[PDB]
Structures are given as structure tokens and as C-alpha cells.
Amino acid sequence: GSNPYQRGPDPTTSSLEASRGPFSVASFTVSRPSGYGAGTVYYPTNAGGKVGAIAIVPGYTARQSSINWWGPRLASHGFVVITIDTNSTLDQPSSRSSQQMAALRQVVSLSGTSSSPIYNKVDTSRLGVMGWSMGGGGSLISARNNPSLKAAAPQAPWNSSKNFSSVTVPTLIIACENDTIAPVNSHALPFYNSMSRNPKQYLEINGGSHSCANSGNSNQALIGKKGVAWMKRFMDNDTRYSSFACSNPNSSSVSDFRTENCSA
């Protein structure tokens, strides 16, 4: 008769393009990271119920600063977000995947720890994955290896293997038109095209370099709208976001849009 995961007010274009959603955000540094280098956890202080959790991994040679604009942006719409540093900045995609999953397990542990900042705030069954470049490849690996995940939204992903045909997790691939590190016809698009079993989307950012979805990017209105919408639609089953998640945004900031198995 209702959706027990639905949080917050009805979305609008304006509300999804803003710097912050409806919820207030707080954060903390993980004191004793387990299975990864470091982490910051971002959370809504006033979501009104448990929320899903998302682990976000940087790229090769990069740190939390590359991807952490997502922390406040997603948390303010009703997600617990952990942004990590890897054990080494040189870690490869499969290692990044292992560390991403370790970070999710630690969020679950923290939600289960009395007097932690996020005690009982996480729906431990509703988890998702994001990350940049090798961390984006790692997110796809995570999805392949962990079909219980509710959503994936890698950005400018890089991976040697391109065959994600087994993936059943709803997956948004954020791509960068002018990517010359993970060029789209070698990385993002083969990954997208390999997937026949899931809701999926290809969102290519017009003029984007490899770092087009990183902190400080010039397209936070569009990219943040789409990432939040995807996570709402699939992490929360929130059908108010079906339009925003599944439809072509008709944006001058998008150079290519493709989607399948996603009803608007």
C-alpha cells in the first residue's frame, strides 16, 4: 500500500540540480579502517528512517578528494556514503573492489555499533557502489561479484575485462566524451553493451575529460541529478524518480544517452 523505503519530498528538476537535497549532512572520519586505507562517512541527520549505504572509490594515483563531492550531495538526499582511500594509490581494480566491499561491511558494522554517529541509520540490506576510473572498474567487479547490491553508478570506468554480461545490478555508467585515459569505446561502452540482464544507462558528458565527474567538475547539476535519481530509483525502489532516472535529460551537457530496461 506504500513503499517503506521512500524518503523525502517529491523531487523536482530544481531540487535535484541544487548543491544539496532536503536533508542536513554530517560526517566523520573512520577511526580504525578495516580492509582499506581510510574513509570518511557522510550521512543525513534527519532522513526520517533508515537509508541505504554507498561506497565510493577513487582512481589510480588518486584519493578521496577526487570523488568526495558525492558524499554531501548523496547524503543530503538520503544515503549514507563512505568515500575511501585505498591501501595504496596504485591498487588495481580487483583490489579496489575488495576494499569497496570491506568499506560497505564497515558501514554496516558502524551502524551496528551503539553510540557511533550512524547507529541504526543504515538499511544494511540496501547497498550500492560508485567510483572513478580503476575505482569504476572496481565498482563493476563489485556488482558482478555481489548481485545483492541494489545499484551501481561508476564514472569514467577503466577495466581490462569488458564482459559484465552476468551483472543484474541496476547500473548507470557515467562516461566522459573526451576521455583519453579510459576511452569510451574501449571501456565505458563495452561495459554498457555487455550488460543484457539489468536496468542500465549510458550517460556521456559533453566535452568531458577523464575527470569530468570528479570533485570540482562544471556539471554537478546534471551529474548529481542523474546519480541521485538512479540511486533513489533502484536503492529505494522510489518510483517518483523513474522519470529522472530513466529518461533522456535533454541536456546540452550530455553528448550521448542510452538506456535499457528502465521505465520512465
Q: What 3 state SS string does the chain have?
A: CCCCCCCCCCCCHHHHHCCCCCCCEEEEECCCCCCCCEEEEEEECCCCCCEEEEEEECCCCCCHHHCCCHHHHHHCCCCEEEEEECCCCCCCHHHHHHHHHHHHHHHHHHHCCCCCCCCCCEEEEEEEEEEECHHHHHHHHHHHHCCCCCEECCECCCCCCCCCCCCCCCEEEEEECCCCCCCCCCCHHHHHHHCCCCCEEEEEECCCCCCCCCCCCCCHHHHHHHHHHHHHHHHCCCHHHHHHHHCCCCCCCEEEEEEECCCC
What's at 199, amino acid-wise?
Answer: P
210 is catalytic: yes
Catalytic residue among 91, 123, 179, 236: 179
Q: Is 15 a catalytic residue?
A: no
Active site residue 133: yes
Experimental method: X-ray
Catalytic residue among 66, 76, 111, 133: 133
Give me the catalytic one of 210, 211, 236, 238: 210
Resolution (angstroms) stands at 1.3
Distance CA 176, CA 59 (A): 15
